[PDB]
Amino acid sequence: MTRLTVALSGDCMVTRGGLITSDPAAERLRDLLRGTDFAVTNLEVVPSDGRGHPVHNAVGGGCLIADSAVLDEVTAAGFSVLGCANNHAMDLGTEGVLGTMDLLRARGIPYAGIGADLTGARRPVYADRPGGSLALLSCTATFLPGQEAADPSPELPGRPGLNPLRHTATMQVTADQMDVLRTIDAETGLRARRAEARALLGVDPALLGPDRLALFGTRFRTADAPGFTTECDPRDLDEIARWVGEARLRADLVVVSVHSHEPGPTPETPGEFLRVFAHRMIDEGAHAVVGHGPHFLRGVELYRNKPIFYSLGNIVSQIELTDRVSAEDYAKVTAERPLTPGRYYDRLSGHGTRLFAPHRRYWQSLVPVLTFEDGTLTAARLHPVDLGFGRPVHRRGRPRLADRAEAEKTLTDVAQLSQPYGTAIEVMDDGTGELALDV
Amino acid sequence: MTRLTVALSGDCMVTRGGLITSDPAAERLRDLLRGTDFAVTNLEVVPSDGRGHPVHNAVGGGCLIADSAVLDEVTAAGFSVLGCANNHAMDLGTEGVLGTMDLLRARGIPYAGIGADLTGARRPVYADRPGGSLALLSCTATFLPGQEAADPSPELPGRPGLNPLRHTATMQVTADQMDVLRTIDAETGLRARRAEARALLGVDPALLGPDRLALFGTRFRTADAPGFTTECDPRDLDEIARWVGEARLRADLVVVSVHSHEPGPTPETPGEFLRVFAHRMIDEGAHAVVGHGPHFLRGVELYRNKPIFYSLGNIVSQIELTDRVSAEDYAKVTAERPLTPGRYYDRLSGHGTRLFAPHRRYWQSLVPVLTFEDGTLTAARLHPVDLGFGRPVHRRGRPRLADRAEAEKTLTDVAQLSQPYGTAIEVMDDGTGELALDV
Amino acid sequence: MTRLTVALSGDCMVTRGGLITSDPAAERLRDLLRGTDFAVTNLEVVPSDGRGHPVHNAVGGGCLIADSAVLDEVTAAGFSVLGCANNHAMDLGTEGVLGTMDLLRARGIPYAGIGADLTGARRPVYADRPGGSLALLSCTATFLPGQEAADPSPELPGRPGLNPLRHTATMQVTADQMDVLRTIDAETGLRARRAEARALLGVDPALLGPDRLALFGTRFRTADAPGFTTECDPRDLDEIARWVGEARLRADLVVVSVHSHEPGPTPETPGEFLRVFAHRMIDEGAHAVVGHGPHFLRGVELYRNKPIFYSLGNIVSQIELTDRVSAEDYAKVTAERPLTPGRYYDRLSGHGTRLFAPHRRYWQSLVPVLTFEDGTLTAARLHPVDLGFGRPVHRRGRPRLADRAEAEKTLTDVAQLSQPYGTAIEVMDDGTGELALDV
Amino acid sequence: GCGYCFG
Amino acid sequence: GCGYCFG
Amino acid sequence: GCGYCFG
Amino acid sequence: GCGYCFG
Ligand SMILES: [Ca+2]
Ligand SMILES: [Ca+2]
Ligand SMILES: [Ca+2]
Ligand SMILES: [Ca+2]
């Protein structure tokens, strides 16, 4: 009875107008997005009319701030529900994120993942249309500590911020490797500098057990063979799952959007904690999990007949076209004269010989279009997107439906990245495809 | 011809009124402070009328926020020039620090160490009186990364914050210890998770040389014997020194106030970088260096006939009396019922069996009173201060001149802590003292 | 692959509504402008809702201020990118220029040449459309000293203003003429009145060398034959060129709009500094240079296959219809009774016997329409515009495509003014034309 | 300020 | 704060 | 962020 | 603008 379509996409790093060019392949992407009931993207940029102050985000690759007019580019392109939790929503601080919420609400754009407090960032947003409703929840595993939103206390307000999915990494080391680490701790004098903390706290904060260790701000555990494990923060995982169970009661479809740069054993595999997280979301009743962060595609998994897109890469990539570069960002490039933004990005990438420009994986994208009937996935179309690899810097990063030859190559990539999950793909003559479903 | 007196003090963590009690020893401390030309303290609390949002400062021991009326307690007690750079000025974020500047300027209180941008935080403040002028510069080596102020760029504003003194720690390890660290890096799979960063940056960010290593967010260097070294950030050191040379041209006296929790080889010794910093300040023309942070006293050094007070501890200590505890602070204490602030601090310290309450070193203080004649130090009086060790929580932390017996014990402590620097002390019958000077 | 059209025009001095009349020739001008990808004009009027105060601009011919509704006349006529640097943008002071930026941004009108500081005035504006992007930079060589914008310092903000192209004039005089000037300086007592400046500065500010002289606020240089030379300010020239190289990296087309009233040896020739400036702009990568200021047409030059329009005159000329005349403007006309604006302009021009009304050159205009293919100029159409010479004051100044006979006369004028540059023109039956190109 | 400019 | 993340 | 700091 | 003035 109820039939709904959802378009998914990755990072929307838009800094300029004319997002949809006069290219027919770009206009057909807008037609595709505007033909769906809901079209989701990750707003990977701070739209601003001037509120807030730049934070030091060198780890994130600099500040990502744009004129608020780019929001009209996003909506006119067809995107209608925004995920906002990512490592850039806080690029203008708490005042910036409050400014973003003001800008989105005044334009009537449904959004999730940020809020004036932690609950508001965790909440789903409900997008209602004549055919039905979609609940979007948005969280991020990549952010600067402290940027997560905070709930109020009886005496103090909350803190505006993002919806966090924290996680811990543990280094598994052999018993002899652990002994050397403790020896380094004692012999360098590092242990001596915790003598004060021992008296105040009553014990050494580095001793978590005789086979567990916290040194150099890292977790070490004795194991038979060296290894590396990651685990979700239990409180974030339980709380996000809690809100998914809430959203499932109040919407036809529940989509969880999660930002995650963290790599697994290989750059193309997701962190193990992310896979546990995605499984939990569907266990709690989500109909899809859309991931992003790495700026390249990752595999697709079908779990209990619901799709997990571990990374849809970038749908818009205009980092190097930003006109708002902070002083701390400029300082990362030695210069014998004050730099303009474009020259700064040219020197930052070594005139295009490093960073994202040389590699083609950073300029292919994918827009899945999912069809649900009463919550059952009945189709998952795959539309490869081309972002213009090798074009001049002012042209690349704008999305268009890839031509047949490039779409087939992208579809092969997705199939190969999805093969470890048992995912199969049917391929159309035009280079588009769709997931093979059990339903 | 020009004769000026300066009172120095450590952390002023004031959260309640009645700072100066009706105790004659407390009234005599106010008389002492109000009898000097300048009386400096470190404002270790955010005075607030409600502007800003609490930041997660668990490392700093929680948020330190108080009614703005405490500023009238500070000035009525006799303090007249405030240092504001410390690990708590940013407890209410950028909006909070702008609110503090508003509150201080409206009350006519000279302050340094915070600003709307980096230059404003680095600037000296000039306090002018009929007998002469003092320049106060204020910086902190202890703060959460990102809390430092930022200067504007051609396109973006600055960021309000504190005046930073950053520093790096390097672990010296033997060549065989270094080999084990690299082996752990490779065998755990940690090196494999940097494969992406290798292609984007062009090289491994962990390889700083074949005898240098960045692992686990820590610096390692091959050395013949294990060790531990710290070094000032060259840019912060050159810039603060730059402003000291500026201040020396425009004031009779230049005082540098530096917040530093970082311990040396032992808890009572300052970090080596702090000692290099203090020497540089006097090399550049400062007349005194006043340190604070650890909440206990550290030694006193005479360098080129100018005093360095590596830590004057606390002059006011009312952390446990704060009425503004954030939600993230409350979460550090497991509770089967919502907690009031006082009960929260009782459970946080294990009902007084840990943290600062049991140890007497955290409740002794020192107020030096320095006399300069044409920039030459001619006297350095030492006035021990008692903060009420063992008194009920609502009474301890308010300062008074220690009685003779306790003042003598504190003076012995200062002499012993200052002995490694060759400092000698003359002792008066009342338990006060003064440094032995070469002039 | 990329094909873009740009309409160019001169001074838009609009003060009334109904800019496009019901005349078919006027409606066809709007159709022409609205059929291009970008249509540039020089906003030679302060649109205002009341912010700011009138400056004394007698040299500029009085204040030029209009209801902000005229901006809707400009955009509805087809203009879509505004150049704002000229000798009238500052007619309401710094508050007025901030009010203009507010008005333009609220209407979504891209603009360049003014800003809250010098960098913002120098920046290009990027106008994005489906077919491509154009970067507009706007500067002016004609303005009252001090009206240029200023960048901030560590302690003080910038100053809102215009993007300047300063220049110096040097009078070449014979050695005997130079001796008489020095003699006049000494014998009048003028040199005696610089005796104070000699002691304070250490030397005579009038002695720049023995063959160079600064007298009467003018530069004199000894030369074999008398002459007159002009030179761009090296800092303005290097900085504008710097921003052109930046814009070329981020847009398909870069257009530099320069306001310049300064005459060359004859009124129709541009100042030599302007020609050096225009050559530099194309050397740095600009695709066109559009000039304005003199209120009549100047020649057109092709340089490295890019067009330089030294002056497109006025596209809208309604000075005498302004309803906002300042008190200092009124004072230039002796009157035995308070004057209304229209009567003031009638008396200022001697009831139409002087100023711009009697001469036909001030009421002909030209709208070039340029076609670029991948940055290569492939067509430069010339559309003569008639501004209604000899019509009543309330009708003249509104633009329409000139009829055949008048368009041919205007095209002859452009050809003759462009002949010294080697420019040739093809002429259509309707009186429109196009430049002969080498491509 | 124009040296050797109307409207 | 990223441990073992551009743009 | 303190590496090897209360109040 | 001073013709033939500091501070
Ligand atoms: Ca990201
Ligand atoms: Ca502290
Ligand atoms: Ca003009
Ligand atoms: Ca004066």
Author numbering:
A (entry chain A), B (entry chain A), C (entry chain A): 1 to 439
D (entry chain B), E (entry chain B), F (entry chain B), G (entry chain B): 12 to 15, 19 to 21
Task: Provide excerpts from the study.
Hence, recombinant N-terminally His6-tagged MslAΔTrp21, which lacked the C-terminal Trp21, and MslA Trp21G variants, with an achiral glycine instead of Trp21, were prepared by co-expression with MslB1 in E. coli. As a result, the X-ray crystal structures of the MslH:MslAΔTrp21 and MslH:MslA Trp21G complexes at 2.29 Å and 2.12 Å resolutions, respectively, with one monomer in the asymmetric unit, which are the same as the MslH:apo structure, were successfully obtained. In a manner similar to the MslH:MslAΔTrp21 structure, the MslH:MslA Trp21G structure accommodated the MslA Trp21G molecule, consisting of the Gly12-Tyr15 and Cys19-Gly21 parts on the C-terminal side of MslA Trp21G with a disulfide bond between Cys13 and Cys19, in the large cleft. In addition, the amide nitrogen and oxygen atoms between Phe20 and Gly21 in MslA Trp21G formed polar interactions with the oxygen atom in the backbone of MslH Gly60 and the nitrogen atom of the His295 side chain, respectively (2.6 Å and 2.5 Å). Because the amide bond was recognized by MslH in a similar manner to the carboxyl group of the C-terminal MslA Phe20, the electron densities of MslA analogues likely represented the binding mode of the original MslA substrate in MslH. The structure analyses also revealed that the C-terminal MslA Phe20 carboxyl group in MslAΔTrp21 and the C-terminal MslA Phe20 and Gly21 in MslA Trp21G are located near a hydrophobic pocket consisting of MslH Gly60-62 and Leu64 on the core domain and Ile319, Tyr345, Leu348, Leu355, and Phe356 on the C-domain in monomer A at the edge of the cleft, respectively. In addition, an architecture that would construct a six-coordination motif, consisting of four amino acid residues Glu44, Asn87, His259, and His261 and two water molecules (w1 and w2), was detected around the C-terminal carboxyl group of MslA Phe20 in the MslH:MslAΔTrp21 crystal structure.
The lasso peptide MS-271 is a ribosomally synthesized and post-translationally modified peptide (RiPP) consisting of 21 amino acids with D-tryptophan at the C-terminus, and is derived from the precursor peptide MslA. MslH, encoded in the MS-271 biosynthetic gene cluster (msl), catalyzes the epimerization at the Cα center of the MslA C-terminal Trp21, leading to epi-MslA. Herein, based on X-ray crystallographic studies in association with MslA core peptide analogues, we show that MslH is a metallo-dependent peptide epimerase with a calcineurin-like fold. The crystal structure analysis, followed by site-directed mutagenesis, docking simulation, and ICP-MS studies demonstrate that MslH employs acid/base chemistry to facilitate the reversible epimerization of the C-terminal Trp21 of MslA, by utilizing two pairs of His/Asp catalytic residues that are electrostatically tethered to a six-coordination motif with a Ca(II) ion via water molecules.
